[PDB]
Amino acid sequence: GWYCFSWPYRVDMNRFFQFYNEMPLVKTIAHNYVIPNGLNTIVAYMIYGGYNQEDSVIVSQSFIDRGGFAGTFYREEKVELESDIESFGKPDPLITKNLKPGANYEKLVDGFVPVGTVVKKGDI
């Protein structure tokens, strides 16, 4: 849920921000001091094909697509230069030396990946 209201400024790790939250239809005094995190889902207590057996739930695909419990998950990458010899840059194709097989290595404008760019598994 809304864990912190300054999330865009912070650089958080393994932090999930949920776009939509609702006050419970049956609220308690604990919500006078904390922010509710969760939606007032219409839930049918029924057997529907045996896909909810043993603590499973059948979720409406439309509910998922409409933003139900959907937010953004944040991870960050961070390292520090060991010494002067270390610097941030797209690597020297001429020198190269010990490098990484695969490891696309492109998209590193001025050594970094520009904002708004999708980074896949192998990308650098």
Partner 1 sequence: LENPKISTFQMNVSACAWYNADFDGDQMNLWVPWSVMSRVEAELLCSVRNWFISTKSSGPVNGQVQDSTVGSFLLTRTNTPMGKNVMNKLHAMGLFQTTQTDPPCFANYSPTDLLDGKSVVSMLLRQTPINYQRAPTWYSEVYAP
Partner 2 sequence: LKMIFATQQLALNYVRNAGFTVSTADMLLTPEAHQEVQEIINELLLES
Partner 3 sequence: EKIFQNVEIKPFLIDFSNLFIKNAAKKLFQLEEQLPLVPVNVVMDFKGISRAAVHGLSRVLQDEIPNYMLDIKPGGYKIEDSTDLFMTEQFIRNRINFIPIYAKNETLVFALRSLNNSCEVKTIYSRDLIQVAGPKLKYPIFNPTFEIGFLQPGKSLIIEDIYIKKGIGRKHAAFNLAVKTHFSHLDIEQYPTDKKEYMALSGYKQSSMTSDPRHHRLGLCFPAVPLPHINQAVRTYLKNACRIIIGRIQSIQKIYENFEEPQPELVLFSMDEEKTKAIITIKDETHTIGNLLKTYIYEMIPDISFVGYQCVPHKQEMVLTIIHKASQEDLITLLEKSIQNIIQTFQILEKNVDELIA
| Radius of gyration of the chain from its Cα atoms, rounded to whole angstroms | 23
17-25, 48-56, 76-84, 99-107 -> range binding partner 2 (CB under 8 A)? 48-56
Measured in whole angstroms, the distance separating CA 54 from the mean position of its chain's CA atoms is 28
Measured from the Cβ of residue 113, the count of other Cβ atoms closer than 10 Å reads: 16
- 67's contact among partner 3, partner 2, partner 1, none, with CB below 5 to 8 A by partner kind, is partner 3
Q: Identify whether 110 is a catalytic site residue.
A: no
CB of 45 to partner 2, least distance (A): 5
Measured in whole angstroms, the distance separating CA 80 from the mean position of its chain's CA atoms is 24
Q: How many Å apart are CA 39 and CA 45, to the nearest integer?
A: 17
**What is the SS3 assignment for 66?**
coil
Task: Rule CB under 8 A: say whether 50 interacts with partner 1.
Answer: yes
Task: Rule CB under 8 A: say whether 65 interacts with partner 1.
Answer: no
Residues within window 22-41 making contact with partner 2, judged by CB under 8 A: none
CB of 8 to partner 3, least distance (A): 3
